[PDB]
């Protein structure tokens, strides 16, 4: 009778099922707390108050990591984290109003979007591409008016990133032609991969 072992496996599976249900949420909450803390005077830390107290550090660090490149896996996790920080409307209940006018406003008080323009400029990985803009709609955080109004002013800097955006677009044009050949004819689909799917979201 290996039934006890089987039962243990079942209990573990139940625990795992719960894990699937939350730890996404729980993990997000921890990360979210960190984002708030960074905005925060270190979430009750802020370098023990003092001279080194502690407001706006996460944004500075993020800019440096983006510049760094790397084994990109850390960057991908960080991109997910940036989205999570924008990734909002729950968990609050430092009474900041949970609106991007405050939030991405303070995120534009942070203003880390040059790296997204750099993510629009340099596109090393397709996952770096498909997430460098995949959260980048936060750069238009509802209003995004300064993120427009400075981003348009930021558009007068170099050629670099603008050329990269054009390449991605051109990339979309090529992809569309391929897709057209790929749809081919009628007279079902797997979602047309996503290359196409990715392009539709990106286009939006």
């Amino acid at each position: 009778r290996n039934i006890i072992e089987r039962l243990q496996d079942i209990v573990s599976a139940l625990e795992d099922r719960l894990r699937p249900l939350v730890q996404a949420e729980l993990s997000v909450l921890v990360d979210v707390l960190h984002r708030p803390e960074l905005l925060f005077p270190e979430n009750t830390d802020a370098r023990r108050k003092c001279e080194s107290g502690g407001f706006i550090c996460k944004l500075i660090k993020h800019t440096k990591q983006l510049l760094e490149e790397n084994e990109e896996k850390l960057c991908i996790k960080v991109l997910q984290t940036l989205r999570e920080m924008m990734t909002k409307d729950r968990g609050y209940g430092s009474r900041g109003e949970m609106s991007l006018a405050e939030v991405q406003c303070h995120l534009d008080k942070e203003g880390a979007s040059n790296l997204v323009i750099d993510l629009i400029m340099n596109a090393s990985s397709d996952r770096v591409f498909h997430e460098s803009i995949l959260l980048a709609i936060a750069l238009l955080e509802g209003g995004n008016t300064t993120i427009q109004h400075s981003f348009f002013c930021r558009l007068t800097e170099d050629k670099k990133s603008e050329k990269f955006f054009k390449v991605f677009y051109d990339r979309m044009k090529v992809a569309q032609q391929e897709i057209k050949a790929t749809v081919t004819v009628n007279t079902d689909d797997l979602e047309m991969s996503a290359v196409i799917t990715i392009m539709q979201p990106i286009l939006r």
């Binding site: 573990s12 625990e15 719960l18 949420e25 707390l33 830390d45």
Partner: protein, 253 residues
């Protein structure tokens, strides 16, 4: 010297990365050995609103925060001003917070793939893998090393189970396949293809699926038709994986 301290501490911190990584794994095994199956799972170790208060129940244990100070220390490590080598270490630490979730994944980390049989496979299976790896790693010097990949790991025991997905999971080189030259490398590749087919030999339904997943240089209809026919045909996979136009490709094939 500051980064010699800092990345030295980062060396300790990266040491502390796998140090707590190791600690977490050991703790999980110990917990797993006795009691609490349902309770143990719920306990961890440290409809829409199910855990949403238990997260709030972690929220006081997070917002206020057996070492709490150690968790705070991880935050201080993140708190260093600007160390690009140190910044890389900080990025690793940031992922590491992710370690609680990682630990949940780590608890799962029970996957992959009898006893004495496993040891024998490691002695060989491992040898075949090593030969292939060496060949990739090191005209014909890797082609001189190709016999370790083609001949070594050539006699696969397809009678023994645990080989189909697990040797499929154990075989990284095969997965990578799934530099064509008319010389030593080309000969080695042809031999390897035959040997590989024999090794896969453990996909009657699953083996076929694995082969399909592995493929990119195949299923055109033209460039590899005779070989494709030899590999497969006239079966239950010829009735479901048997979509047409191959003779249109075989019209050029």
């Amino acid at each position: 010297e500051d980064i010699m301290v800092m990345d030295t501490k980062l060396k300790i911190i990266e040491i502390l990365q796998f140090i707590l990584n190791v600690r977490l794994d050991y703790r999980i095994s110990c917990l797993l050995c006795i009691f609490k199956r349902e309770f143990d799972e719920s306990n961890s170790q440290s409809v829409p609103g199910a855990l949403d208060f238990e997260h709030i129940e972690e929220q006081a244990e997070g917002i206020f925060g057996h070492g709490g100070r150690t968790f705070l220390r991880v935050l201080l490590h993140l708190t260093m001003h600007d160390y690009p080598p140190l910044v890389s270490g900080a990025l690793q630490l940031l992922f590491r917070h992710f370690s609680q979730r990682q630990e949940v994944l780590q608890a799962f980390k029970q996957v992959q793939l009898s006893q004495d049989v496993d040891n024998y496979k490691q002695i060989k299976q491992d040898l075949d893998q090593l030969r292939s790896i060496v060949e990739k790693s090191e005209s014909y010097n890797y082609r001189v090393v190709k016999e370790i990949l083609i001949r070594l790991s050539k006699l696969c025991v397809q009678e023994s189970a645990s080989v189909r997905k697990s040797r499929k999971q154990q075989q990284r080189l095969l997965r990578n396949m799934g530099k064509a030259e008319d010389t030593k490398m080309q000969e080695i590749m042809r031999l390897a293809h035959e040997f590989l087919q024999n090794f896969c030999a453990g996909n009657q339904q699953n083996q076929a699926l694995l082969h399909k997943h592995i493929n990119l240089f195949l299923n055109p209809g033209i460039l590899e038709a005779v070989t494709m026919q030899h590999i497969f045909m006239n079966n239950f996979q010829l009735c479901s994986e048997i979509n047409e136009r191959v003779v249109q490709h075989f019209v050029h094939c």
